[PDB]
């Protein structure tokens, strides 16, 4: 089997991407944030505290003939941005882009943090990191990909995120029309439950490539590119008037600037992030200070190849017995 779904930026800054997902019988279609940095499929639901729902589409398990309470199971998750959600668990039929999993754990939110309530565009998350990070207790649950894997034509999914445009998540096949040149594969560590890999270095603009190992995660559910402070300082030093602002919470730059590109290494290959991808616009409406899309990871404890980096590539998440990542230009 295969599946293919379009993913759409939630706003003009590509802050995140939503992908329609069919849950239950008859289908209830919710727009989920596909997150390769987490391993829970959770949704706004009929159980979510009413004051914490503001425009999201909810899953109502009582209206699904295939929903079953997973008796005793709870979940609770805290994300790197300080957001959180928790609740109970159903199993149900879940389809993505024509690919169907029966018995998928659908984590029904009883509580969500303010950032989730405030984002009317995201009805929940679909985790695509390794199932070892799933938070369901006392019986840990599998991701949608892990449940689908054995049925897929090839045990892979691909992320093809757009810059200010829709893109695609494919399951079970590699669309050889969706990228240019060849796919370069690189090793993955699953020891922290992430798609963790080592970039071979970077360049700023037309500058020379610096060969240096940068361990980080491929994370579709993180907007920005978080890299070591040395690398980030080297990037923003090429932008007149850029500075790190403790009050704003990262590097800002004059909105009048033209940003340089940023290149990262994948083995001997190179992915180029155009400068425009690094512009996250005014820090507040009407400001001439713009927020940078490359930020320090120093306060995180891990480097994160988030959407800013991933949207510059066609990315293969290879879930074979020994997982690997693939990157191609596009
Ligand atoms: C959607 C999400 N993934 N991880 C945490 C969150 C909630 N907070 C944010 C911060 C920017 N946005 C769009 N949503």
């Amino acid at each position: 089997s295969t599946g293919s779904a379009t993913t759409t930026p939630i706003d003009s800054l590509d802050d995140a991407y939503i992908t329609p997902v069919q849950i239950g019988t008859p289908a209830q279609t919710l727009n989920l944030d596909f997150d390769t940095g987490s391993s829970d499929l959770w949704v706004f639901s009929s159980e979510t505290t009413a004051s914490e729902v503001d425009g999201q589409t909810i899953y109502t398990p009582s209206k699904s003939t295939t929903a079953k309470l997973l008796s005793g199971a709870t979940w609770s998750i805290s994300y790197g941005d300080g957001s959180s959600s928790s609740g109970d668990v159903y199993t149900d039929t879940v389809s993505v882009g024509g690919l169907t999993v029966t018995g998928q754990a659908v984590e029904s939110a009883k509580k969500v943090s303010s950032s989730f309530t405030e984002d009317s565009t995201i009805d929940g998350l679909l985790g695509l990191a390794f199932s070892t990070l799933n938070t369901v207790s006392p019986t840990q649950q599998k991701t949608f990909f892990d449940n689908a894997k054995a049925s897929l034509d090839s045990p892979v999914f691909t992320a093809d995120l757009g810059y200010h445009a829709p893109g695609t998540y494919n399951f079970g096949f590699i669309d050889t029309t969706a990228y240019t040149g060849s796919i370069t594969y690189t090793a993955v560590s699953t020891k922290q439950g992430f798609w963790e890999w080592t970039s071979t270095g970077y360049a700023v603009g037309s500058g020379t490539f610096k060969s240096t190992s940068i361990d980080g995660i491929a994370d579709t559910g993180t907007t920005l590119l978080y890299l070591p402070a040395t690398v980030v300082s080297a990037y923003w030093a090429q932008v007149s008037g850029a500075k790190s602002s403790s009050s704003v919470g990262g590097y800002v730059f004059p909105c009048s600037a033209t940003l340089p590109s940023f290149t990262f290494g994948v083995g001997s290959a190179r992915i180029v992030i155009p400068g425009d991808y690094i512009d996250f616009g005014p820090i507040s409406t009407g400001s001439s200070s713009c927020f940078g899309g490359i930020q320090s990871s120093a306060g995180i404890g891990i480097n994160i190849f988030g959407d800013v980096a991933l949207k510059a590539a066609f990315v293969v998440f290879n879930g074979a017995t020994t997982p690997t990542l693939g990157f191609a230009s596009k």
Side-chain angles (χ1 to χ4, degrees), residues 1-62 64-67 69-109 112-141 143-148 150-190 192-242 244-330:
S1 63
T2 63
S4 184
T6 298
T7 194
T8 301
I10 62 161
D11 68 18
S12 64
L13 297 178
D14 295 345
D15 283 320
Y17 299 79
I18 48 172
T19 309
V21 178
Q22 284 69 50
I23 310 177
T25 308
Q28 301 180 36
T29 299
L30 273 67
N31 298 325
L32 300 193
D33 184 353
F34 283 24
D35 181 15
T36 63
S38 70
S39 304
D40 288 49
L41 193 177
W42 73 259
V43 296
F44 279 79
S45 70
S46 59
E47 302 179 329
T48 309
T49 301
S51 60
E52 295 181 351
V53 182
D54 185 10
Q56 296 80 9
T57 295
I58 61 167
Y59 169 60
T60 304
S62 65
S64 176
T65 60
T66 43
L69 179 73
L70 184 65
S71 187
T74 62
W75 63 278
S76 183
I77 194 162
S78 317
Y79 298 106
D81 65 357
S83 71
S84 60
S85 54
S86 62
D88 60 13
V89 186
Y90 295 80
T91 59
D92 209 341
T93 301
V94 172
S95 301
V96 175
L99 170 66
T100 299
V101 167
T102 60
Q104 172 68 43
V106 177
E107 303 172 32
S108 167
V112 305
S113 67
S114 57
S115 58
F116 288 115
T117 298
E118 288 162 3
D119 185 359
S120 72
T121 71
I122 289 173
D123 300 325
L125 272 62
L126 187 148
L128 290 169
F130 290 92
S131 295
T132 57
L133 297 177
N134 174 267
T135 77
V136 177
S137 178
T139 307
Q140 188 171 62
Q141 301 294 305
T143 72
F144 174 82
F145 178 57
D146 216 336
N147 284 323
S151 306
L152 296 177
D153 292 355
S154 184
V156 302
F157 66 90
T158 65
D160 181 8
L161 301 181
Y163 168 66
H164 296 346
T168 306
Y169 281 104
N170 291 328
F171 292 82
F173 70 107
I174 286 159
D175 180 355
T176 62
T177 75
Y179 59 85
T180 62
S182 53
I183 305 176
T184 300
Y185 289 87
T186 197
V188 164
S189 174
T190 66
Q192 295 190 84
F194 298 123
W195 292 93
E196 187 171 2
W197 66 291
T198 301
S199 173
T200 51
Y202 69 98
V204 177
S206 60
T208 62
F209 186 85
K210 175 73 167 179
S211 292
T212 188
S213 291
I214 304 172
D215 180 292
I217 66 166
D219 184 2
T220 58
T222 289
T223 316
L224 301 192
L225 173 53
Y226 293 89
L227 290 176
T230 48
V231 177
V232 174
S233 181
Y235 178 79
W236 288 107
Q238 297 305 312
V239 178
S240 289
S244 182
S245 168
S246 56
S247 61
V248 173
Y251 279 89
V252 295
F253 69 93
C255 295
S256 59
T258 302
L259 297 177
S261 64
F262 184 89
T263 301
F264 63 96
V266 185
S268 56
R270 304 292 177 251
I271 299 295
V272 179
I273 306 170
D276 286 352
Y277 289 27
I278 299 162
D279 181 5
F280 279 76
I283 59 170
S284 300
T285 309
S287 180
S288 71
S289 295
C290 275
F291 198 64
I294 296 178
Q295 296 296 342
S296 179
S297 63
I300 300 179
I302 200 159
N303 300 307
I304 307 174
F305 294 84
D307 299 332
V308 162
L310 304 181
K311 76 180 70 179
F314 177 88
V315 187
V316 180
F317 294 81
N318 171 24
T321 305
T322 297
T324 66
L325 283 165
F327 295 81
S329 296
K330 64 186 189 192

Coordinates of all heavy atoms in Angstrom, one line a residue, residues 36 156-161 168-170 173-174 178-179 183-185 195 197 218-220 264 271 305-306 309-318 324-330:
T36 N 7.7 14.9 12.9 CA 8.8 13.8 13.0 C 9.6 14.0 14.3 O 10.5 13.2 14.5 CB 9.6 13.8 11.7 OG1 10.3 15.1 11.6 CG2 8.8 13.6 10.5
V156 N 9.0 3.4 4.2 CA 9.5 4.8 4.1 C 8.3 5.8 4.2 O 7.2 5.5 3.7 CB 10.3 5.1 2.8 CG1 11.5 4.1 2.8 CG2 9.5 5.0 1.6
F157 N 8.6 7.0 4.6 CA 7.7 8.1 4.2 C 8.6 9.3 3.8 O 9.8 9.3 4.1 CB 6.8 8.5 5.4 CG 7.4 9.1 6.6 CD1 7.6 10.4 6.8 CD2 7.8 8.3 7.7 CE1 8.2 11.0 7.9 CE2 8.3 8.8 8.8 CZ 8.5 10.1 8.9
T158 N 8.1 10.2 3.1 CA 8.9 11.4 2.6 C 8.1 12.7 2.9 O 6.9 12.7 2.9 CB 9.1 11.3 1.1 OG1 7.9 11.4 0.3 CG2 9.8 10.0 0.7
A159 N 8.9 13.7 3.3 CA 8.4 15.0 3.5 C 8.9 15.9 2.4 O 10.1 16.1 2.2 CB 8.9 15.5 4.9
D160 N 8.0 16.6 1.8 CA 8.3 17.6 0.7 C 7.6 18.8 1.1 O 6.5 19.1 0.5 CB 7.9 17.0 -0.7 CG 8.2 17.8 -1.8 OD1 8.8 18.9 -1.7 OD2 7.6 17.5 -2.9
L161 N 8.1 19.6 2.0 CA 7.4 20.8 2.5 C 7.7 22.0 1.5 O 8.8 22.2 1.0 CB 8.0 21.2 3.8 CG 7.8 20.2 4.9 CD1 8.4 20.7 6.2 CD2 6.4 19.7 5.1
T168 N 3.9 17.9 0.1 CA 3.4 16.6 0.1 C 4.1 15.7 1.2 O 5.3 15.7 1.3 CB 3.6 15.9 -1.2 OG1 3.0 16.8 -2.2 CG2 3.0 14.5 -1.4
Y169 N 3.3 14.9 1.9 CA 3.8 13.7 2.6 C 3.3 12.5 1.9 O 2.1 12.2 1.6 CB 3.2 13.7 4.1 CG 3.9 14.6 5.0 CD1 3.3 15.8 5.4 CD2 5.1 14.2 5.6 CE1 3.9 16.7 6.3 CE2 5.7 15.1 6.5 CZ 5.1 16.3 6.8 OH 5.7 17.2 7.7
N170 N 4.3 11.7 1.5 CA 4.0 10.3 0.9 C 4.5 9.2 1.8 O 5.5 9.3 2.5 CB 4.8 10.2 -0.4 CG 4.3 11.1 -1.5 OD1 3.1 11.4 -1.5 ND2 5.1 11.5 -2.4
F173 N 6.4 5.0 -0.7 CA 7.1 5.1 -2.0 C 7.9 6.4 -2.1 O 7.5 7.4 -1.4 CB 6.1 5.0 -3.2 CG 5.3 6.2 -3.3 CD1 5.5 7.1 -4.3 CD2 4.2 6.5 -2.5 CE1 4.6 8.2 -4.5 CE2 3.3 7.6 -2.6 CZ 3.6 8.5 -3.6
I174 N 8.8 6.4 -3.0 CA 9.7 7.7 -3.2 C 9.3 8.2 -4.6 O 9.6 7.4 -5.6 CB 11.1 7.3 -3.0 CG1 11.4 7.2 -1.5 CG2 12.0 8.3 -3.7 CD1 12.7 6.4 -1.2
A178 N 9.8 14.2 -7.8 CA 9.6 15.3 -6.8 C 11.0 15.9 -6.4 O 11.0 16.8 -5.6 CB 8.9 14.8 -5.6
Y179 N 12.1 15.5 -6.9 CA 13.4 16.0 -6.5 C 14.3 16.1 -7.7 O 14.0 15.4 -8.8 CB 14.0 15.2 -5.4 CG 14.3 13.8 -5.7 CD1 15.4 13.3 -6.4 CD2 13.3 12.8 -5.4 CE1 15.6 12.0 -6.7 CE2 13.5 11.5 -5.7 CZ 14.6 11.1 -6.3 OH 14.8 9.7 -6.6
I183 N 19.4 11.3 -4.3 CA 19.1 11.4 -2.9 C 20.4 10.9 -2.2 O 20.9 9.8 -2.5 CB 17.9 10.5 -2.5 CG1 16.7 10.9 -3.3 CG2 17.7 10.6 -1.0 CD1 15.5 10.0 -3.0
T184 N 20.9 11.7 -1.2 CA 22.0 11.2 -0.4 C 21.5 10.8 0.9 O 20.9 11.5 1.7 CB 23.0 12.4 -0.2 OG1 23.5 12.8 -1.5 CG2 24.2 11.9 0.7
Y185 N 21.8 9.5 1.3 CA 21.4 8.9 2.5 C 22.5 9.0 3.6 O 23.7 9.0 3.3 CB 21.0 7.5 2.3 CG 19.7 7.3 1.5 CD1 19.6 7.3 0.2 CD2 18.5 7.2 2.2 CE1 18.5 7.2 -0.5 CE2 17.3 7.1 1.5 CZ 17.3 7.1 0.2 OH 16.1 6.9 -0.5
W195 N 14.8 11.1 14.7 CA 15.5 11.0 13.4 C 16.7 11.8 13.5 O 16.8 12.9 13.0 CB 14.6 11.4 12.2 CG 13.4 10.5 12.0 CD1 12.2 10.6 12.5 CD2 13.4 9.2 11.2 NE1 11.4 9.5 12.1 CE2 12.1 8.7 11.3 CE3 14.4 8.6 10.5 CZ2 11.7 7.5 10.7 CZ3 14.0 7.4 9.8 CH2 12.7 6.9 9.9
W197 N 20.7 12.6 13.1 CA 21.7 12.4 12.1 C 22.9 13.4 12.3 O 22.7 14.3 13.2 CB 21.1 12.5 10.7 CG 20.6 13.8 10.4 CD1 19.5 14.4 11.0 CD2 21.1 14.7 9.5 NE1 19.3 15.7 10.4 CE2 20.3 15.9 9.5 CE3 22.2 14.7 8.6 CZ2 20.6 17.0 8.7 CZ3 22.4 15.8 7.8 CH2 21.6 16.9 7.8
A218 N 15.9 15.7 12.4 CA 15.0 16.1 11.3 C 13.7 16.2 11.9 O 13.0 15.2 12.3 CB 15.1 15.1 10.2
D219 N 13.1 17.4 12.1 CA 11.9 17.7 12.9 C 10.9 18.6 12.2 O 11.0 19.8 12.2 CB 12.2 18.3 14.3 CG 11.1 18.5 15.2 OD1 9.9 18.1 14.7 OD2 11.3 19.0 16.3
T220 N 10.0 18.0 11.5 CA 8.9 18.7 10.8 C 8.1 19.6 11.7 O 7.4 20.5 11.1 CB 8.0 17.8 9.9 OG1 7.4 16.8 10.8 CG2 8.8 17.0 8.9
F264 N 23.8 23.5 4.3 CA 24.2 22.4 5.2 C 24.6 21.1 4.4 O 24.1 20.8 3.3 CB 23.1 22.1 6.2 CG 21.8 21.6 5.8 CD1 21.6 20.2 5.7 CD2 20.8 22.4 5.4 CE1 20.3 19.7 5.4 CE2 19.5 21.9 5.1 CZ 19.3 20.6 5.0
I271 N 22.7 20.9 0.7 CA 21.4 21.5 0.6 C 21.5 23.0 0.9 O 22.0 23.4 1.9 CB 20.4 20.8 1.6 CG1 20.3 19.3 1.3 CG2 19.1 21.5 1.5 CD1 19.7 18.9 0.0
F305 N 17.0 20.4 12.9 CA 16.7 20.8 11.5 C 15.2 20.8 11.3 O 14.6 19.8 11.0 CB 17.4 19.7 10.6 CG 18.9 19.8 10.6 CD1 19.6 19.1 11.6 CD2 19.6 20.6 9.7 CE1 21.0 19.2 11.7 CE2 21.0 20.7 9.8 CZ 21.7 20.0 10.8
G306 N 14.7 21.9 11.6 CA 13.2 22.2 11.5 C 12.8 22.6 10.1 O 13.6 22.4 9.1
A309 N 15.0 24.3 7.3 CA 16.0 23.4 6.6 C 15.2 22.4 5.8 O 15.6 22.2 4.6 CB 16.9 22.7 7.6
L310 N 14.3 21.7 6.3 CA 13.7 20.6 5.6 C 12.9 21.0 4.3 O 12.9 20.3 3.3 CB 12.7 19.8 6.5 CG 13.4 19.2 7.8 CD1 12.3 18.4 8.6 CD2 14.6 18.4 7.5
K311 N 12.3 22.2 4.4 CA 11.5 22.7 3.2 C 12.5 22.9 2.0 O 12.0 23.1 0.9 CB 10.7 23.9 3.5 CG 11.5 25.2 3.6 CD 10.6 26.4 3.9 CE 10.1 26.4 5.3 NZ 9.3 27.6 5.6
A312 N 13.8 23.1 2.2 CA 14.7 23.2 1.1 C 15.1 21.9 0.4 O 15.8 21.9 -0.5 CB 16.0 23.9 1.6
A313 N 14.5 20.8 0.9 CA 14.9 19.5 0.4 C 13.7 18.6 0.3 O 12.6 18.8 0.8 CB 15.8 18.8 1.4
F314 N 13.9 17.5 -0.5 CA 13.0 16.3 -0.5 C 13.7 15.4 0.5 O 14.8 15.0 0.3 CB 13.0 15.8 -1.9 CG 12.2 14.5 -2.0 CD1 10.8 14.6 -2.3 CD2 12.8 13.3 -1.8 CE1 10.1 13.4 -2.4 CE2 12.0 12.1 -2.0 CZ 10.7 12.2 -2.3
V315 N 12.9 15.0 1.5 CA 13.5 14.3 2.7 C 12.9 12.9 2.8 O 11.6 12.8 2.9 CB 13.4 15.1 4.0 CG1 14.2 14.4 5.1 CG2 13.9 16.5 3.8
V316 N 13.7 11.9 2.8 CA 13.3 10.5 3.0 C 13.5 10.0 4.4 O 14.7 10.0 4.8 CB 14.0 9.5 2.0 CG1 13.5 8.1 2.1 CG2 13.8 10.0 0.6
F317 N 12.5 9.6 5.0 CA 12.5 9.0 6.4 C 12.4 7.5 6.1 O 11.3 6.9 5.9 CB 11.4 9.5 7.3 CG 11.6 11.0 7.6 CD1 11.2 12.0 6.7 CD2 12.1 11.4 8.8 CE1 11.3 13.3 7.0 CE2 12.2 12.7 9.1 CZ 11.8 13.7 8.2
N318 N 13.6 6.8 6.1 CA 13.7 5.4 5.8 C 13.6 4.6 7.0 O 14.5 4.6 7.8 CB 14.9 5.1 5.0 CG 15.2 3.6 4.8 OD1 14.2 2.8 4.9 ND2 16.4 3.2 4.8
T324 N 17.5 5.2 8.1 CA 18.4 6.2 7.5 C 17.6 7.4 7.1 O 16.3 7.3 7.1 CB 19.3 5.7 6.3 OG1 18.4 5.4 5.3 CG2 20.1 4.5 6.7
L325 N 18.2 8.5 6.9 CA 17.6 9.7 6.3 C 18.2 9.9 4.9 O 19.4 9.7 4.7 CB 17.8 11.0 7.1 CG 16.9 11.1 8.4 CD1 17.5 12.2 9.3 CD2 15.5 11.4 8.0
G326 N 17.3 10.4 4.0 CA 17.8 10.8 2.7 C 17.4 12.2 2.4 O 16.3 12.7 2.8
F327 N 18.3 13.0 1.8 CA 18.1 14.4 1.4 C 18.4 14.5 -0.1 O 19.5 14.1 -0.5 CB 18.9 15.4 2.1 CG 18.6 15.5 3.6 CD1 19.1 14.6 4.5 CD2 17.8 16.5 4.1 CE1 18.8 14.7 5.9 CE2 17.6 16.6 5.4 CZ 18.1 15.7 6.3
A328 N 17.5 15.2 -0.8 CA 17.8 15.6 -2.2 C 17.4 17.1 -2.3 O 16.5 17.6 -1.7 CB 17.0 14.8 -3.2
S329 N 18.1 17.7 -3.2 CA 17.6 19.1 -3.7 C 16.3 18.9 -4.5 O 16.0 17.8 -5.0 CB 18.7 19.8 -4.5 OG 19.8 20.0 -3.6
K330 N 15.6 20.0 -4.7 CA 14.3 20.0 -5.5 C 14.0 21.3 -6.1 O 14.9 22.2 -6.0 CB 13.2 19.6 -4.6 CG 12.9 20.5 -3.4 CD 11.9 20.0 -2.5 CE 11.4 21.0 -1.5 NZ 10.6 20.5 -0.3

